[PDB]
Design a protein around this ligand. Structure first.
Ligand SMILES: [K+]
Ligand SMILES: [Zn+2]
Lengths: 364, 5
């Protein structure tokens, strides 16, 4: 009941390994967690596959049927695919519908675990694909498992907070709940013209009855642990005080970590860990999700460290022997060292963004 | 529409 649920099965991880943009990442992530024996301190729960009905609670039938169609053989040359956002970012690799349904079902399973009181924390490190819209794939996302998980949590919880610490704006989740006040979305992300997905300015606050229940923290290149936590803590403080969430869905994309090929933010898992800690302190039902992360070893280093944070365990600095040990050479340590490049975030711009958010939350 | 990626 105080032991975290860990969504895992060998067959699930294998399916997640087949995602075109992150091959073998799921295995590496689970393998490192196992090498630190953290799984022995968690309740391993095998994920159910998301039914068509569960998927259609957010995704349109036309899009679902298309995804299912091209997924059968692997038709990544189907002419109608561009309408549904399939193509370069989201290729129609065969089985992708079933793979996406497994991840969708995995996040739903985690949510159900939280509803039933089995745990206060549930983890799906292979979820967090928060870009996908109701009728189109987007940003390596085919099904929006985060939205599916949130819709599941809505069975018990009347006020759900979504926090995305991914490098990219969680536009799909924000879109899904743009018009409602039951769910508040909070996204910290890089915001710069031409940078995916191009949305999520501090002025974007949702629409209609959902106005001011969308929160965006636009951030520039090169932010590091200290400044990032200061921003995050001060935003989450106001949000908690104003929104009074009953449940939290936390997306922890590792594409902000130094050494990611995207080379934008300059974070270490320790900085993200402090953000996670601040949220965990609320002692609310918390769904933990992964996301982006394209330095695979570093992404495993990050989420392994974060699992330790969840368990309150200090981990050994040395990477333990396991299947992918050689991927962590030549230093073989868990810690990540930041790059020596500039922080483009002026403190005055940061402060104004902050105060602008403070003002918006007053209406809440 | 943007490219990610
Ligand atoms: K909202
Ligand atoms: Zn991302």
């Amino acid at each position: 009941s105080l032991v975290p649920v860990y969504i895992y099965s060998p067959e699930y991880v294998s399916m997640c390994d087949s995602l075109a943009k992150i091959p073998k990442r799921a295995s590496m992530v689970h393998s490192l967690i196992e090498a630190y024996a953290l799984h022995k301190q968690m309740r391993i729960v095998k994920p159910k596959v998301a039914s068509m009905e569960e998927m259609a609670t957010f995704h349109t039938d036309a899009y679902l049927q298309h995804l299912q169609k091209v997924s059968q053989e692997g038709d990544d040359d189907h002419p109608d695919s561009i309408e549904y956002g399939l193509g370069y970012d989201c290729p129609a690799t065969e089985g992708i519908f079933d793979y996406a349904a497994a991840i969708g079902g995995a996040t739903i399973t985690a949510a159900q675990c939280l509803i039933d009181g089995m745990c206060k924390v549930a983890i799906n490190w292979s979820g967090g694909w928060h870009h996908a819209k109701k009728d189109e794939a987007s940003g390596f996302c085919y099904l929006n498992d985060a939205v599916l998980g949130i819709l599941r949590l809505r069975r018990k919880f009347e006020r759900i907070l979504y926090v995305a610490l991914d490098l990219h704006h969680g536009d799909g989740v924000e879109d899904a709940f743009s018009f409602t006040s039951k769910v508040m979305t909070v996204s910290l992300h890089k915001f710069s013209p031409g940078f995916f997905p191009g949305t999520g300015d501090v002025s974007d606050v949702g629409l209609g009855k959902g106005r001011y229940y969308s929160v965006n923290v636009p951030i520039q290149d090169g932010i590091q642990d200290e400044k990032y936590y200061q921003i995050c803590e001060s935003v989450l403080k106001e949000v908690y005080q104003a929104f009074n969430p009953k449940a939290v869905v936390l997306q922890l994309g590792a594409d902000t970590i130094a050494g990611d090929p995207m080379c934008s933010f300059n974070m270490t898992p320790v900085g993200i860990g402090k953000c996670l800690k601040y949220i965990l302190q609320w002692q609310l039902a918390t769904l933990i999700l992964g996301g982006g992360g394209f330095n695979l070893a570093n992404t495993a280093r990050c989420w392994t460290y974060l699992t330790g944070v969840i368990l309150g365990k200090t981990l050994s600095s040395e990477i333990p022997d396991h299947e992918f040990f050689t991927a962590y050479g030549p230093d073989y340590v868990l810690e990540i060292t930041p790059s020596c490049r500039p922080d483009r975030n002026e403190p005055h711009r940061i402060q104004q963004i902050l105060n602008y958010i403070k003002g918006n939350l007053k209406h809440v | 529409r943007h490219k990610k990626x």
